[PDB]
Amino acid sequence: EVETFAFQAEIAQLMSLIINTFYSNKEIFLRELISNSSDALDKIRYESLTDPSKLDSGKELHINLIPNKQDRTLTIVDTGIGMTKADLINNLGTIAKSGTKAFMEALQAGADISMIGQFGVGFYSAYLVAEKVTVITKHNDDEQYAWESSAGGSFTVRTDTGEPMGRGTKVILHLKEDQTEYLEERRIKEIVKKHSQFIGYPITLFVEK
């Protein structure tokens, strides 16, 4: 049962801008995704302080970076708070609409794509290097979902019957043919050290094979 939705015009426009604008500093996508994971981890930790049972789905708070050359994917995994179906289909888009407007106005004023995170829409920077993005997420008290989009103005959502993850989010980046450098251990280590060296959670970079 796969449902297809249309991105709001503003988000579709943002994605097209990210995909079409000539901008060489693409590596910043990783920092934005790790930052999103860190925020999600901060939230579940905060909520667990008043309701310890929210960690029954997993006490470990961390981030895993998993590259796979055979599938040509780079997956950013976290055990943060996770997203509900409502987040994926309506709420995150509602919030992203205003962030997108501010970002594009900032761009015409002289800002550049690397500052996308200051507008709450850094997630979409994933399209700087991925032709398709698959997001698997599980929030307590909601089912595990699989969100997916190759841009083009639409995305899909389905209940994920794959391997249960407990709680958290996995952003699976199906890399563009000319962006496989982000599957190399050397490259990922360099980027994490450069832009995400102070994240307050363990970041484990898995090795290939």
In the complex, least distance from residue 44 CB atom to ligand DZ8, rounded to whole angstroms: 8
User: Of the ranges 13-21, 61-69, 74-82, 178-186, which one interacts with ligand DZ8 (CB under 6 A)?
Assistant: 74-82
Closest CA to 92 of 42, 48, 39, 50: 39
Contact between 74 and ligand DZ8 per CB under 6 A: no
Which residues 178-207 are close enough to bind ligand DZ8 by CB under 6 A? none
**The only residue of 7, 29, 123, 145 in contact with ligand DZ8, by rule CB under 6 A:** 123
* DSSP one-letter code for 179: G
| Burial bucket for residue 104 (CB in 10 Å: 0-12, 13-18, 19+) | middle
H helix runs in the chain, sequence order: 9-20, 28-48, 85-86, 92-108, 185-195
The window from 16-24, 31-39, 58-66, 172-180 that contacts ligand DZ8 (CB under 6 A) reads 31-39
CB of 163 to ligand DZ8, least distance (A): 18
Tokens coding 58: 């997993």
| Those residues with Cβ within 8 angstroms of residue 69's Cβ, 6 or more apart along the chain or in another chain | 180, 183, 208
User: Please, are residues 74 and 183 in contact by the beta-carbon 8 Å criterion?
Assistant: yes
As to burial, measured by CB atoms within 10 angstroms (0-12 exposed, 13-18 middle, 19+ buried), residue 4 is: exposed
**Residue 33 has which token pair?**
């995704």
Q: Does 157 bind ligand DZ8 (CB under 6 A)?
A: no
Q: Which of 15, 92, 165, 191 binds ligand DZ8 (CB under 6 A)?
A: 92
Residue nearest to ligand DZ8 (CB): 40
Tell whether residue 165 is a contact of ligand DZ8 (CB under 6 A). no
Is there binding between residue 175 and ligand DZ8 (CB under 6 A)? no
**Number of residues located near ligand DZ8, criterion CB under 6 A:** 18
Under rule CB under 6 A, residue 135 binds ligand DZ8: yes
The Cα–Cα gap between 126 and 65 comes to 14
Q: Which is nearer to ligand DZ8, 156 or 184 (CB)?
A: 156
Name the residues that contact ligand DZ8, by CB under 6 A. 36-37, 39-40, 43, 78, 80-83, 88, 92, 96, 121, 123, 135, 147, 169
